[PDB]
Design a binder for this molecule. Sequence first.
Ligand SMILES: *[C@@H]1O[C@H](CO)[C@@H](O)[C@H](O)[C@H]1NC(C)=O
Ligand SMILES: [Cu+2]
Length: 626
Amino acid sequence: TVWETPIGVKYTQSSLECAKICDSDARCNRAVYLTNDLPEGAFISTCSFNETSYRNAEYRICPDTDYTGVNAKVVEGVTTIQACAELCSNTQDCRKSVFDHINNACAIKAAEPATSIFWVQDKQFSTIRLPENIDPAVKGKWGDLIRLPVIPVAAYIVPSYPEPSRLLFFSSWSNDFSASGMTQFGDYDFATGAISQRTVTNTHHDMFCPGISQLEDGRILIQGGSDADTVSIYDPATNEFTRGPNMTLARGYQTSCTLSNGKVFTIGGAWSGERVGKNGEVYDPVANAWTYLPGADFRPMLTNDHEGIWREDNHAWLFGWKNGSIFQAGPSKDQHWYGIQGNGTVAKAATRDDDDAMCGVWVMYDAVAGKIFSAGGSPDYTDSPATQRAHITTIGEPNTPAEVERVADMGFPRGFANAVVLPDGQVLVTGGQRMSLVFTNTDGILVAELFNPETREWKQMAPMAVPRNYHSVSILLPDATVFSGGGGMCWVQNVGDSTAGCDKTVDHSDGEIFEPPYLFNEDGSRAARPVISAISADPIKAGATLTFTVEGVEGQGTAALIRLGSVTHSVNSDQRRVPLNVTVSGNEYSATLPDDYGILLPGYYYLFVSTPQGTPSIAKTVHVIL
Ligand SMILES: *[C@@H]1O[C@H](CO)[C@@H](O)[C@H](O)[C@H]1NC(C)=O
Ligand SMILES: [Cu+2]
């Protein structure tokens, strides 16, 4: 039984008497004789309670909320929201101010985006702001926080027909780690809003800190981690997990990559198992067998880290390429070619930079042209300032030099950011912080950045609401929007220990979705999406001609395949864009897939038809076979 204030607050002489008394007092959580939807402390994207205007220039007040961050001013005078508003009006460049109900003080928040300001639920304060004017045609648009049972520390799209509908995500034995043998998964149907959780135990696998690759049949191979030698295989068909063969060498914080021939290569992962650099290894799904590749030498790919070998072989930028080759774009200052021939091979490809970029963002935005875009990262895993440097790396024949062009610096240094490639081939960078500090919100960049390789120029997007630092994720949805989620997780010694001394402020058991500009016309209305009306649900093979019916476009539409995504620790080794050429005869479109499985990696892809102005369809799922 729960009374709900005129504003929207909810509690659990009288009883509505003290309850009324409690909602007078900014210092009252309990009373003897408060239970809102989101608890005190919770981050917000919108006022949870009823807003209020206040006046020749107007402000919107959200009660029972704080703006965390560097203040430009804190003044002990003010005793009314009115007066705090009045003071924000007389302070140059004040967009955000905070009234402290308990101490009668007005804070003016400092300037954005140089400062990072966060909107928290706290009954002790109220927030005052100057109405924002975001043109979604230029800056895209964020929806509101979607709350989740598990922090999405790792996440992947489930391959389904006609288009994927579900996002699986997962943490450790707990939803907010410690060899446990359990893994808490969340399940999010974004067709419906449906959100379930489960606990995966059959595999005897805590899948925290793993390699993730999508196989030919769209099964998801989840490798090592808290259980350093254990391997689980997720079958979309079953919606079940199966044990795979133990890896040959136990690993965590490694990258795996699906190859042209549908085997999976992994190298490094010194976080768990022995604390030593880790040589390469290849999984063959047909033989269902791991093979150790000693000549896949780890030494050439090490970073130099103040914390040592524990870190230096972590989170490798691996792309599966032509004739079963592996390109390693970083994060080591030097790029290399790795292979699975003999006892495995290694050779220098190029120098990307003068310093390492651990957990920088990387994506193959243009497979047919061998084009890779890198930005951000930091020279050491933690306690190191992030770089603004970004590069286009061009790869041709395996085991011959690569070309690196430095491009425009990002507007912000980002450590632990995420990147997705979009159907137009632009790369959207999200989250990360100015100084890589594991388990912190400190100086989280909220402003997303769109990089356009056509112009080799950056564009600052609308801000998201929650800092997406360490243990955050970015993945592409079938509607060509971007999910940004997670952040946090606590070190807990034993397994089953109760999180009471952990900092819950750094946990964000939630996500938020960004509409890029391309979903909007000049007037900020949603633009008219092509419809792929008809498509064979049939497997297709490299070199084949894909045929589909596109209704709802003014002019000749373009098309592109985006491989489905897997993501954790700023590593998405499964995403890649294959641009297609379209020949239009009627409303029936046809494209000849590339001849090379090094470009068209076996697996499930999004097909997108886009308007000539660059507005993409919802995707139809497309399965490439070997
Ligand atoms: C598409 O067509 C152009 C001209 O033939 C070509 O340069 C491009 O690389 C082709 N293949 C693609 C884009 O898959
Ligand atoms: Cu971690």
